[PDB]
RNA sequence: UCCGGCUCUACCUGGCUGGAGGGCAGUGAGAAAAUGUUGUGGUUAGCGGAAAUGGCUUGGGAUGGCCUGCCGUAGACGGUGAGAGCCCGGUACGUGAAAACCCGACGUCUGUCUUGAUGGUGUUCCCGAGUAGCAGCGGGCCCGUGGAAUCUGCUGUGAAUCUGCCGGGACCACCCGGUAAGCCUGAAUACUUCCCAGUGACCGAUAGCGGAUUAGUACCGUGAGGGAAUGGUGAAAAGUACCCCGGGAGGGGAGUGAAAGAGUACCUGAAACCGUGCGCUUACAAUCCGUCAGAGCCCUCGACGUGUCGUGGGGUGAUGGCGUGCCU
RNA sequence: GGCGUCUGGGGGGAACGCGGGGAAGUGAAACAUCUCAGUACCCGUAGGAAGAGAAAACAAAAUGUGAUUCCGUGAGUAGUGG
């Protein structure tokens, strides 16, 4: 999904647009993620408050310098691996 | 005789092409062109619409119940058209809509459309759409903007002009056609018709010969 | 070509047969089973792939409106909280196979010709037999028995080998064409259980497959067989904590939600059908149930005063006149 | 005939192929010849296709074509038919 558990993302659409958070659960079969402090609901248990999954298209991976980007891939020729890179600055993310 | 001056993507005039009268000066014929384009669109249409008649629907081979004594209507099958789930009476079946339009009518309609375009000097000739060997949509878009400011354009280039076709492929209002595939519908759908010099010469050679 | 061994036996002459080059063909109809190397040749998983967190405003939400940029060999199509080329999957365009299989190619391999070839001269033999032909009874040919050729089944009879035989729509003569009773043969053609990729001036839940839901299911029949009905909360379940009436069901507050005139009996929510409330009317009256006049009452819009008309409008209608439902 | 040992077969499958058997409703305003129709159905067999195929052919005096198959015409014609 180009975004993984433990990544930090910026919400680019929805109610919580502009809020930064950390991906704690990823749902590849749903294209949804769980992000800290965004999309919080008020479930009636008393009435507790917790996050709800958000479509993976509404978030963007932030750079080392905190700027959102599309993520791309470069191939390392030494080991045959394949790492995620930022398209804004080229640095490794 | 109407004169078309060739333009290059560099922005300068190259030469001229003489448009023959019998190809670009015929009097447009509205009814003829209407018939030709209607036949064209009918040939395009595919009739893949079908229904099941009273005999193709499943089951219903046995006469249901007592004709008499019941006090009910007499029914010969459960698939009769008046029944829910029964067959269709006069429903669509697959068919071909193409028409056998005469050749002279088609050619005359094309000539009328092109002559209408040439009367209002909507015909342009260029040496090439872009500098060769590498497609570039920006350059082709700029060149087309210089040529015309209209919305829909028709680009007529040779089948070997791959770079130009790829260059103008992505533009929303551009439709690309080969010189031997010129037709009334595509001409009449376009505000401007930009010709390639080789394509223009090929069309003239095919017709005026 | 050369060498070798045989044509009763050896000698000198003509033919059969092996071994070396040289070819020539190949899994092919023309004989066959194999076995190797190679082809970014193909198929069977994939991977990369440009450009907006843009500004203002509406809004729960922007993917709307207005205004700025940018990519484009990519403005196909979908998704994303409402119409997205620049958010996501992708798209143009490039790339990728250990193994298996399929196509090629070059080889081992096999067969095969070389004991060979040419154009000349006058005669005997051979050229597909229970066959052709004929007759009887049928089939099928435009041809339904007809003057009925060609082809063909059963039953009888039954020839010739080239100056022989068959055909040219009865048949005969002459010309012409061909060579039966032996066998193989690719392409052009037909089709889609199944797999892959697409398309629609095709359907959109009584439609489209019988089957969008337990579908050849439930159910019916001894059996062969027949054969249904049933889609939509919301963007997210955030699916109503807690309190009250009640045995529960159900409801009222309270919350969630943009909306509960979205509460898992859930989009929209028509008609028939069933209520409740208000206005007018109706218990001396013979009614195809309306229509034309029409008092009274109620409501409403204008003008002037206090209620009283008007180029008014609506509801109900006591009462009078007329009036024999629709279709076939 | 028996005994032993090797190699095959058997059944399924939607359409298409080939070879056999073969209706009736219907039309003819009745009906039997005829039509329907060599259809429906049935039997035997395949192959990726099958079947056919290399003149005992046409043709008509042309010093003419040259295996088979399939497509268009010829042509609803020549004909054939209670």
From Swiss-Prot, chain A:
Keywords linked to the UniProt accession: Ribonucleoprotein, Ribosomal protein, RNA-binding, rRNA-binding
Record's keyword annotation contains Secreted: no
Disulfide bonds: none
GO MF annotation terms: rRNA binding; structural constituent of ribosome
GO cellular component, one term: ribosome
Record carries keyword rRNA-binding: yes
GO biological process: translation
Domain of life: Bacteria
Pfam families: KOW, ribosomal_L24
PANTHER family (alphabetical): MITOCHONDRIAL RIBOSOMAL PROTEIN L24
Assembly behavior: Part of the 50S ribosomal subunit.
Family affiliation: Belongs to the universal ribosomal protein uL24 family.
Protein name (record): Large ribosomal subunit protein uL24
Gene: rplX
Swiss-Prot record, chain B:
Organism: Mycolicibacterium smegmatis (strain ATCC 700084 / mc(2)155)
InterPro entries hit by this protein: Ribosomal_uL4, Ribosomal_uL4-like, Ribosomal_uL4_dom_sf
UniProt region (Disordered), positions on chain: 42-99
Pfam family, any one: Ribosomal_L4
Homology family: Belongs to the universal ribosomal protein uL4 family.
Keywords from the UniProt entry: Ribonucleoprotein, Ribosomal protein, RNA-binding, rRNA-binding
Assembly, per entry: Part of the 50S ribosomal subunit.
General function of this protein: One of the primary rRNA binding proteins, this protein initially binds near the 5'-end of the 23S rRNA. It is important during the early stages of 50S assembly. It makes multiple contacts with different domains of the 23S rRNA in the assembled 50S subunit and ribosome.
GO BP annotations, alphabetical order: translation
Molecular function GO terms recorded: rRNA binding; structural constituent of ribosome
GO cellular component: ribonucleoprotein complex; ribosome
Protein name: Large ribosomal subunit protein uL4
